[PDB]
């Protein structure tokens, strides 16, 4: 299992996507609600608001609201989910808000690359804040 406590969003997603595609057992991202998204507050909120309200009702883009749904969607883009390889990879990913009971006390590991300590300044927001600004109870 992978703990998303204080990790960059795209860096984490890229690493997880590649080592899903390499072919192994399934992976678990827990605490997927305090992942970091570097960038100023206003710009992040603006971009996510425009992403949220963009579709048409019958067939438009249905961007999710829940935090783990957002993280799953972010990983979904770095992956050929229309092919068979990509669909099989998407079948082996499980991102949880908080800690599920069955993964309680499980052994964890982290991506040493995606670390908020590796950031120049203090210009970032946490994923749960954007989730609540988009109107989600988690």
């Amino acid at each position: 299992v992978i703990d998303a406590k204080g990790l960059i969003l795209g860096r984490l997603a890229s690493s997880v996507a590649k080592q899903l595609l390499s072919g192994d057992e399934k992976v678990y991202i827990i605490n997927a609600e305090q992942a970091i998204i570097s960038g100023s507050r206003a710009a992040t909120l603006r971009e996510y608001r425009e992403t949220r309200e963009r579709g048409a009702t019958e067939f438009g883009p249905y961007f999710p609201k829940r935090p783990d749904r957002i993280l799953k969607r972010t990983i979904r883009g770095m992956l050929p989910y229309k092919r068979a390889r990509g669909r099989d990879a998407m079948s082996r990913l499980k991102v949880y808000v908080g800690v599920p009971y069955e993964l309680k006390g499980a052994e964890t590991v982290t991506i040493p690359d995606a670390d908020m300590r590796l950031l120049s300044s203090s210009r970032y927001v946490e994923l749960g804040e954007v989730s609540q600004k988009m109107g989600s109870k988690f």
């Binding site: 009702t57 019958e58 808000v97 908080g98 988690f138």
Partner: protein
């Protein structure tokens, strides 16, 4: 092009407009408890309409202190039985049922709806729920009630209707204790609502079958010379050249009626016990005559006669405590001719 502006035809806050999946209204939101323990809902069957002459007492109203005529809907409310207790758990993904305990004694006619539960665990299951609440897992408690339509005569059915209600208290322990006290008993309408208070009503509306755009959305007919050219009750245009599709917001034909609707701030004018005080000569049309206890509601109520009406205490009321209405005359004229 100098266009003349017009509000949109009909409301899109109720779409899609499809048949209700059940014949029993379901409540999505329960109010906040502000008093001693009690149920937050009740059920009954609609009969018909009359009018009463009551001394006006609405504060600050123009017609204060003088007689007025008011339309009222009479609703038959035989006593209900509290048949089970259900416990819910809160987590990230919302509430989740985690336990139920049924009453030992039940009506034999409940076998028509579901097979009768057998008396297994009653004390042990209740203490199990108590231990769960003691270890802080349970968040709220709900009661399961059903009606007993066999006592009425104007309603042909003899099979009960099962639904879930809510208990009103300021603590989970109090709700559990009250639910234990009232489990497996008969609750009368007077134990839930006080005379003169407001309520919210839900019910399935009258069904009209498939209807066209004019009667379903209230669009305009074709006027003048266009009224005799081939299209009179059809819609004008289905869309523009681009986008090359028909929008879901364009009026079209389909199901009309038999949806679930809610009415707000209906006042209760009288809690009765004897049916001879409301029954007109010759009885109500297509129903018969009232036999049990009833209740008078100011205004109209969604749904036709012989339909189940659910009641819950108000969720968006404004006005303060009103008081007991002063009913002077209740019309018992024949509804026929």
């Amino acid at each position: 092009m100098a266009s003349i502006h017009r509000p949109k035809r009909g409301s899109l806050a109720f779409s899609p407009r499809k048949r209700a999946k059940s014949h029993i209204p379901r409540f999505r939101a329960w109010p906040e408890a502000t008093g001693e323990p009690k149920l937050q809902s009740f059920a009954g069957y609609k009969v018909g309409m009359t009018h009463v002459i009551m001394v006006d007492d609405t504060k600050n109203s123009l017609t204060q202190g003088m007689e007025i005529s008011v339309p009222v809907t009479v609703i038959e409310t035989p006593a209900i039985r509290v048949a089970a207790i259900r416990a819910y758990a809160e987590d990230s993904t919302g509430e989740k049922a985690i336990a139920e305990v049924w009453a030992a004694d039940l009506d034999p006619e409940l076998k028509r709806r579901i097979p009768i539960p057998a008396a297994g665990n009653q004390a042990e299951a209740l203490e199990n729920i108590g231990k769960l609440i003691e270890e802080g897992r349970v968040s709220d408690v709900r009661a399961v009630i059903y009606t007993l339509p066999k006592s009425l005569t104007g309603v042909p059915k003899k099979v009960p209707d099962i639904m879930e209600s809510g208990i009103s208290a300021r603590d989970l322990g109090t709700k559990f204790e009250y639910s234990k006290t009232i489990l497996g008993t008969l609750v009368s309408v007077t134990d839930v609502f006080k005379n003169g208070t407001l309520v919210d009503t839900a019910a399935i509306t009258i069904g009209k079958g498939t209807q066209g755009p004019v009667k379903r959305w209230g669009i305009q007919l074709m006027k003048g010379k266009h009224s005799r050219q081939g299209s009179l009750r059809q819609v004008g245009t289905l869309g523009a050249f681009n986008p090359s599709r028909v929008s879901w917001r364009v009026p079209q034909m389909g199901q009309m009626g038999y949806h679930q609707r809610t009415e707000f701030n209906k006042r209760i004018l009288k809690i009765g016990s004897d049916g001879e005080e409301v029954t007109p000569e010759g009885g109500f049309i297509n129903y018969g005559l009232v036999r049990g206890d009833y209740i008078l509601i100011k205004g109209s109520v969604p749904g036709p006669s012989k339909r189940l009406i659910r009641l819950r205490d108000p969720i968006r009321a404004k006005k303060a405590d009103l008081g007991e209405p002063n009913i002077l005359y209740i019309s018992r004229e024949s509804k026929q001719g």
